[PDB]
Structure formats: structure tokens, C-alpha cells
Amino acid sequence: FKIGSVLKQIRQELNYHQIDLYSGIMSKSVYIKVEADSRPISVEELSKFSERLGVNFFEILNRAGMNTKSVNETGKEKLLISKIFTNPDLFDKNFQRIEPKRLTSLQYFSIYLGYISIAHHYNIEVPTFNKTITSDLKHLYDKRTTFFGIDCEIVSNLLNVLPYEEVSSIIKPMYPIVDSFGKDYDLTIQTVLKNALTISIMNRNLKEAQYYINQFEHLKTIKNISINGYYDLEINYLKQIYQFLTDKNIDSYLNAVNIINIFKIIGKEDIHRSLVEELTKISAKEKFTPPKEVTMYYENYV
Amino acid sequence: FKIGSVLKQIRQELNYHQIDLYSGIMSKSVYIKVEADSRPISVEELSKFSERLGVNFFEILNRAGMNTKSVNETGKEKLLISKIFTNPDLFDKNFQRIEPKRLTSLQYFSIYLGYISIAHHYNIEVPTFNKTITSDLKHLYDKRTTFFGIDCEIVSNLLNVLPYEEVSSIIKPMYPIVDSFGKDYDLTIQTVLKNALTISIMNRNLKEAQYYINQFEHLKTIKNISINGYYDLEINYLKQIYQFLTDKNIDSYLNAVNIINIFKIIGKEDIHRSLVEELTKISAKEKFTPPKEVTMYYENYVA
Amino acid sequence: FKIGSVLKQIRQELNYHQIDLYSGIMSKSVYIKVEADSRPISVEELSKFSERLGVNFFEILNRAGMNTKSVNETGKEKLLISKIFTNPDLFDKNFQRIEPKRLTSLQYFSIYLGYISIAHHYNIEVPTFNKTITSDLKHLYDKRTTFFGIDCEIVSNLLNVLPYEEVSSIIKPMYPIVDSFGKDYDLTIQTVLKNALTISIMNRNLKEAQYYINQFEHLKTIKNISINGYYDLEINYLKQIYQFLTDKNIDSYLNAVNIINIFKIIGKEDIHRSLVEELTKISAKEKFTPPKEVTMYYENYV
Amino acid sequence: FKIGSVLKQIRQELNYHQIDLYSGIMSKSVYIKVEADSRPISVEELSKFSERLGVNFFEILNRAGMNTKSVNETGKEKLLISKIFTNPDLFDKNFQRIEPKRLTSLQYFSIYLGYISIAHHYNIEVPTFNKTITSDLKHLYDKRTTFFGIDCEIVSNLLNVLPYEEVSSIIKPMYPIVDSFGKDYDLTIQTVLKNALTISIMNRNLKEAQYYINQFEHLKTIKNISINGYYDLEINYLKQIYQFLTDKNIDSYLNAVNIINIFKIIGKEDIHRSLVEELTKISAKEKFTPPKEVTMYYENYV
Asked: Which part of the chain is the HTH cro/C1-type domain (chain B) (predicted)?
């Protein structure tokens, strides 16, 4: 909401005068009301002012307090999730308010599935879920033809609380992607590929695996797309295991290990742990012992 | 610009009715004008509507045509750069119009530095530059206390067309960062660090190099920060060369080479070729022959 | 043959006089006959003289022409083999004189097996072989209780021209070794182990494989034993495969590859080539692709 | 000494009759005395018999008790050394007997130098040594023109108890080697090069180091030479350090390290330790930190 004050702050910082901003855009008096936060500001006007100051439209919006995912109701409900995770106590109270609201907006539905995500983790019983989901997804997706970041977010969520086959039908129509709509969007569409790929690999479903690999590679060709490098790495590690599952070939295995280790080296222990675990499982599956190096870390993480 | 039609498109797609959007926000009639793109829309109204649809405010703005860096005059001028790079022909004409406008805004200055960057690359003579920059930078930065993404952008540009010492003064006040203002912002501030660190390492300036490493590792601690993985890697390769230049230590050297290789593996040949080059040079400086692996690639893809 | 002349040569080199050699061993006159090569010399006398000069008994023997594997008839026939290898032309003529003499001495049988090794390699047909071997082996080994270097040598030969099962019975009673009888002896008894272990590994016969590994490790504890380092290395590489085949374990595979490379690094191309090849085959069998590094030499050696 | 019995044992083992051995060599009765160990046996006869049996001349001699380095006085005195090493108590008594006999034969000198080696290790004072060696070495080598294994043995010994400079002049004339005189000889000549190369590398004397490398690589061209693989490896490691000292180059460093590690992998911990230590010292000398892997091994080797 407080865009005007941020405009003032930036203007003064750069030693511009009000006239430098408002002239040919609005009257002096109107502009002062804008800058006082007493008049709301059109996207257009703000975009113009942004040009004049020279600082970036989205940075201004973010300094004006949209960086915080809080200034509206849905935002607050989303922040609520991480609280409820660390303190499952709070679940039932809030979940009872959210379960009915779930189909209000795609955002709400994504929040809902965040609840279910927690419920599965803490063994909490949510009978409603199993009754409703198939019908929910039907309602939400059956006559859909365009999809937005929020749908990919939803799908990552679904992947995390449902069998892959109950999700895959919903995924396939949203890919391939042909435009970036900002780094925020870019990241969302990637997250789905990365999780789906992991699952396909873990299930030894090499056809779906290949698909996800292509879809990701395909993103790289998009204009102004913004690839997550940690993702590029991890997906590359998966591509590496894929070539090993397809051709049990030793360099691919070595490469996979090497990438796992590189996450450790650059301090991304989160990822290191998961990949160490995956690798051990996938090796077990293929009747195979990973390097002592990694079963080392494995047994100590757990 | 066309936010209203995007609202509509998304509305219908989700099978919301107009009332679902506008009620308790504006009159039915006024909404219809918004949706028709005939009435402008306040940030606050749009934010509200975004909540209603369930799709993210920024995504909507970007579908509405802000993802293109072209809907305003400064944007177009920015696009012009890559054109003029690939066909230096066009330089003179445009640069004549831009050199004068360079202090109009930070954006214009950054654009101006892009032209200089090109001129350097194509040996084009730009006498104005050497006369003006010290003065320009003084104008721009002498009485400055808060800095925005665009300043970091400018700083990366400067690093790339001026000696380090001529820029370091300008950099140091902008760090440490203490807040993210979006992934756009977050990338800009990292890019400076990366480019500066690379130069500090390449100059064997280990004090500055450490500073940049620290400023990068600090970013990690910022809330909602969004670290570039490719940078994380590259920086890390630099950290590795750093421990090697301080302690002439073999593991460090091997890790550096390993990282070089990983970029190769993941298809980042741009980066792979730069790092191979660096490593070669740093090695030569320390009277040292890099693995045959790396000098092989160097000769069939750099020499 | 010419030991006396070597004694003179060494004696004068060291500025001893004849008396310094012969005194308390034989008369002046007799010694001069020995030194002229007109009287033969007892092992005991030569040993004593060896002590007085200070140069080593075997060195003197070897300088007197025992280094050359030629000064006797069997020696010559052994040398003959490598000639007949490089020009199979000469086979039939010689092989016709040898095949009948093959049970004259263990030496002769070893030479005969050399011919068969050649015949196998150049596809020459030797029907006599298949008819006689089982009988031959029976004749040679049925009532044997001690074994000599030559037997080991024979066994290596056998391993190289027969299936393992037809040989293993003959091998088993020759191990464990408990005495060294010189470096010549020591080498022979190791060669058998190495070949046998290679075969076992190749056949995935892990029980016999481990037996051979143990027999080799046992040699190491023998007093004055003389272990061949190239063997130690190669056997170690095979131990490393063994652990891999028993436990599909990656460090073992990498070590094995590492050893292969070490042979290349030190210029032992012969060995490098065969190990590259083996590893390739072993990898094939376990549905596995060796590092690209080694599949390069496998193609370009061929 | 007991050759006759060995001949009998072998004869009977192979089911030869006396006549098969003695015919055209000696009378039946004579042969019986030979086989009884009542008549001594000429090298030439023994060689002939060796042919007839089909087992190797040297093996037989070794089975007859020459494998033990004990059946003569000098032999015993050499065995004494390892005893006196593990219990320096015994030193003074024995050394008093040996110090005066040291110039009796090269063998005795070699033994004598083994005493000095011990003395040096246990800080025992041997003033005689420093008085006499220069003159001793002058006495032994001033007028020499050919050299035998024992001289190389002596030179290894001297390298180990004297400064390099005081020994080099003595080494140079003995190389390059042009003939193998058996595996025993072959090893002795290699040992000197190894040790000398080590010292040259450790003193950073790259000219001598290169000389020794060349001398060793020359041996490999010798006909019937028998190269020690462990030495081949270690000298290769040294070559590898040599390239690194000459042109501070990373792949050579890497390779040296690798070799060090191979020794460990094949269980040769004696050598592993020495090479780890050397590498650490050379590294320190060049202002350089070896891999943490190897300084972990230096940390506890103290």
C-alpha cells in the first residue's frame, strides 16, 4: 500500500524534485496526494515514475511492502503453514477453517494441500481428503486450457501427497512451457519438473523420466527464462542416474556421485542429504553398493 | 498496459463471474471499464483481484506485458544494445543520441556503459568517456546513501569498462546488503559480487577477493534471499582458487578443476570456457601447468 | 661351461693370486688345470672359490654361460618355441620330432605344451593332443607327491590350453608352498596363481578365486620368498574385482580401474591391455559399462 | 652340500632309474657314490643330470641347501646382522670381531657396513669408521675396472651411511650395466639406482636424479633383465616428482600421489609410509601442502 512514501524516499535520495516526477503525468497537487499515500496510484503512473527515477518497477513495489507475502488474507494463510508445521498442535483449529475454503481460489487449494502435506508427515488423519480430492481436481482442472504458476505450485503439492498416476494427467497439459512470466513464475514451473523427475527416477519409470528431462531442457530454450542453477545441477544428477538405469554405465554413476559431492562442497546440505539418500535407494534397487564415501554420509545424516 | 484483458482471461478460465472479482472493491460498471482496459487500475485494486483469482500478482503483471523490457522508451533503448553489439555498424548513430542523455537516469547511465562496453570490444574510440566518467561518477554517487538494483547493475557495467580501483570506492558503500527486494534485485546484487571477486582473484588481490567472498556468503543469511546456484558454484570455484593462492594447496586446485568440469557436465559451456581460461592464466601466473584435460580444451576451444 | 676362465677373470680383476684361491682347496697344478677349463670343477670347490673372491656363486655360474638357456639340448628346444611362434611355418617339422619326445622329461612336456599353445592360437589342428593329454597327465601326475618349479610351469601352460576343470585337480596338491628355492622358483609358483586367479575371476568362480588369492598372500609370509611386484599389483587388481563381484561395491571397482591405470602410467602396456580387456568383459557380464577412459584403450588396442 | 640326495629324490619322484641319469656321464658305481653324497659332483655333471630330470639347475642347487644363506662362514655372518639389529646388545662383541676382518672380502666389507648402518640408527659410536672409510674405499676401488653384484650391494650400503658426495665417484664407473647375470644380480644393480635416485630427489639434485632415472630405464633394454616391479613403481613415482620439481606441474604431482596410494592399496605399507614421508618433506621444501589424505598418514606415522 505505501508506494507514495517509497516514491518520495527514492526521489529525495536521487535529488529529484516533485516536478521531475509529475510533469506530463499529473498535476502538482495530485502528485502530492499520491506521495502522501492519500490517492491510490495506477499501475501506469507508477510505471512512468519508475522510469523517471531509474529504479526498477518491481523493486519499488517490493520496497512498498509486496516482498512480504502478508499484506492480504491469502498471504497470511500461506505464512501460517510453516508455523503449523513446526507446531502440529495448531493444525486442527485452522485446518477446520481451511478445508471448507479450499476451492475458493487456486491459492486456497494450494494452501489446503500444504495442510495435507503436514498431516501425512505427522500421521494425522484427514478422511475428508480421500473422499474429496478426485472430485476437487475434477472441479478445478476438467475444463481448463491455460495454466498459471499457481497451478504448477498446486501440482508440486499434489505430487507430494498423491500417487504419481493420480497426478500425471493434470501435469501433461501444462507443458511444454513457451513463455517466462518473471523469475517467480520461472521457478515454479521448474519445481514441478524437478519433483516429477525425481519421482519417475525413483519409480524406475524411465519413459516419464525422459519426458521430464526434455521438458526441463526445453525450458532452457525459452526467451528470458531464468533457470535455477541448483535445479540445473540436481536435474543433471538425475539425468546422470537415468543414463545409468538405461545402460548400467559406470561414468554416469560416477558423475552422479560427483554432483552429489559438489552440493556438499558448496554447503547445500539439505540437497546433499536427499541425494545421498536417493542414490543409496536407487543403488539398493539395482543390487549395488554406493561408494563407502556416500553410505558414510548416508548413515550419519539419518 | 493490458491488465484488464488478462484479468478477464484468467477470470473466465477459472469460471469466476465478474461479481466474484469486483464485489466490495468497485461497482459492476466501473469493473467493466477496468476489464475493458478503458479505466486504469490501481496497484491496490489489482492486488486485490489477484488474491481473488488465486494467481500471483507479479505473474499477472507479466502476462499483462511487463515481462517484455520494451513497453517504455528506456526499455527499448536497453534492447537496442544487443542489436548494436552484433552489428557495430549501428553504434555511431545511436551512441550520438545516448551519450548526451546518459545522466538522465541511472538506467540511461547503465545503457551508456553498455555502449562503452561494446566500443572497448570493437576498439571504437570514445574520447568522451575518458573525459567524463570520473566527473559522471562523482555526479552520480558523491552524495548517495541508499542504493538500488540499478546501481549494482551500473557497478557491474563499470567493472567491465574501468580499472578496479576506479570502481571500488563506488562499490564498498552498497554492501553489505540487508534485504531482498525480489529475485530481480537479488540477482543484480550477486552479479557485482561475482564479477568483482573474479577480478580480485585475477589481480591476485587477496584482500579484496576475501571481501567479496564474505559479502556473498553474507547474502546467504538474508531472509527470502534467492541465491543464484550457477553463481554459487562459480564463486565457490573462486573461493577454491583463493585457498590455493593463499596456501598453494593441492586439494583446492583439484576442487577448482572439478567445478570447471561440472559446468561442462551440465552444459554450461559459456562458463566452462571462461573458467578454463581463468584457470590457465592464474596457473601461468603461479608458474604452473594445469591438467592436460583443461589445456587440451583450451587449445581446441579458446586458442 | 667355461667357469675356470671366469674365475681367472675375476681373480685378476681383484688382484688375487692363484694361491689365494687354491690354498687349502687344491694343489697349484690342479688349480691351473681348473682355471684352464681342462679339469672340471666340483660345486663344492666353486662354492669355496666364490667365497674367496667375494662374488656370488650364482653370478659366477651365470657369467660362465648358464644365463643363456642354450648350452644344452632341452635349452635349445625351449628357445625354438618363440621362433616357431613368430613363423608358424616351422611348426610341423619340429612338432613332429617333439610330440613323440613330450614324456621324456617334464621339460619336454612343458615344451610340447608350448607347441599346443601355438597351434591353438594359429588354429592349427593337433588331434594327437585331445587323444593323449588325459592319459599324459595321468602318466605324469597320478603318483606324484613332491613338485618342482617345472611342474608349476607345466600347470601354467595347461591352464592356457585346457579348461580349468581339467587342470584344477593337478594344481591343488602343489599348494600351499612352504619354501623358496630361489627367485627363479619363486616366480614360477607365482605365475600359476596369477593365471589361475585370472581364470577363476573370468569364470565368476569366486570360491576358487579366493583360494588363489589366499595362496598368493600365503607366499608372502614365506622366508626369503621373492614376490614379483607386477604380479602383486595385478593380483591386487583381481582381488579388487573379486570384492566387486561378491559385493557389487563401487570403491572396489574404482580401485581396480586405478590399478589398470597405474600399469599404463609405468609403461607396462602389455599388462594394461589385458586388464583393460578383462575389465571390459567382466563389466559386460555384470551388465555394466566401464569408464569411457578404459573403453578407449580397448577399442584402440584392437 | 647334499646334492646327491636331491638328485635321488628327484630321480625317484619322476620314476627314472639310475641308468637314465648316469649313462654316458659316469659309471654306475661312481654315480652311486655321487647320489650317496660320498663323491663330490662337478658343475658340469650336475648340469647334465639337471637336463635329464627336466628340473632346473638352480632349483636343484637351492633344494640341496644353497637357498639358505648359511652353509658357509660369511653366510652366517650376514644372517647375524638382522639379529644384531633387533638386539643391539650383541653389537660390541661381534663388531669387535668384524671391524678387523672388513677388508678380507667384499662380502665382509658389506657386512661391516651393515654394522655401521646399525650403529648410526642406535647412535652407537664407531670412531674407527670415520678414520678408516676413506682409506678403505681407496683400497677397495682405486684400481678396479669390473664390478660385480657385491659392489653394488656395497654401494647401496655406503649410500646409507655416508654423504652422497663421498659415494658418487664410486658409483659412476659401475653403470651403465650391459648384462644380466641372474635375478639375484639384477636386483642388486637396481637397488642402488633406487636409493641413489631417492637421495638425489630428496637433495633436489635434479642432474644426478635424471642420471639415475636414465640408468634404470637403460636396464630395461638389457636382454633377459629382470626388472623389479615394486622398484619400477617407486622409481616411477620419483620420475613423477622429478617432473614436478623441474616444471612445478600439477598432473605429475597428482600421479606421484596416485602411485603412493597404489602401494597402500596393494598392501605395501613399508613403502607407502616412506613415500608419504618423502612427499611431505619435498612438499614442505617447495612451500606446499600435500593432500590432506597423505598428511593424515604422516600425522600418525610419527
From this structure: 6-60
